């Protein structure tokens, strides 16, 4: 959903609210200067009934950042933080 920007002079960083998705339901790939985040969870009951969800969000990276140095981690509250050093 809402994405927060936490860039600094030394690190490229974004945080994404994905509270409906578990760690095994998210994927983060980096290719050709674009970070791609995909999520998909099967049908299950929430507070209102049965629902399934899927999404794909893409971020553009500044030029020259090593795609092998991108790290992603989900918090127990459901915040996905994607990070990488600046060139």
């Amino acid at each position: 959903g809402v994405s927060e920007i936490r860039h600094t002079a030394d690190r490229w960083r974004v945080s994404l609210d994905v509270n409906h998705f578990a760690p095994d339901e998210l994927t983060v790939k980096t290719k050709d200067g674009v970070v791609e985040i995909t999520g998909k969870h099967e049908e299950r009951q929430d507070e209102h009934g049965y629902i399934s969800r899927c999404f794909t969000r893409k971020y553009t990276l500044p030029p020259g950042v090593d795609p092998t140095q991108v790290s992603s981690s989900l918090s127990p509250e459901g915040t996905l933080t994607v990070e990488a050093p600046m060139p």
Binding site: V18, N19, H20, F21, A22, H41, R44, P76, E77, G78
Partner: peptide, 5 residues
């Protein structure tokens, strides 16, 4: 299923 705290 988790991720909602």
């Amino acid at each position: 299923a988790l991720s909602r705290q």
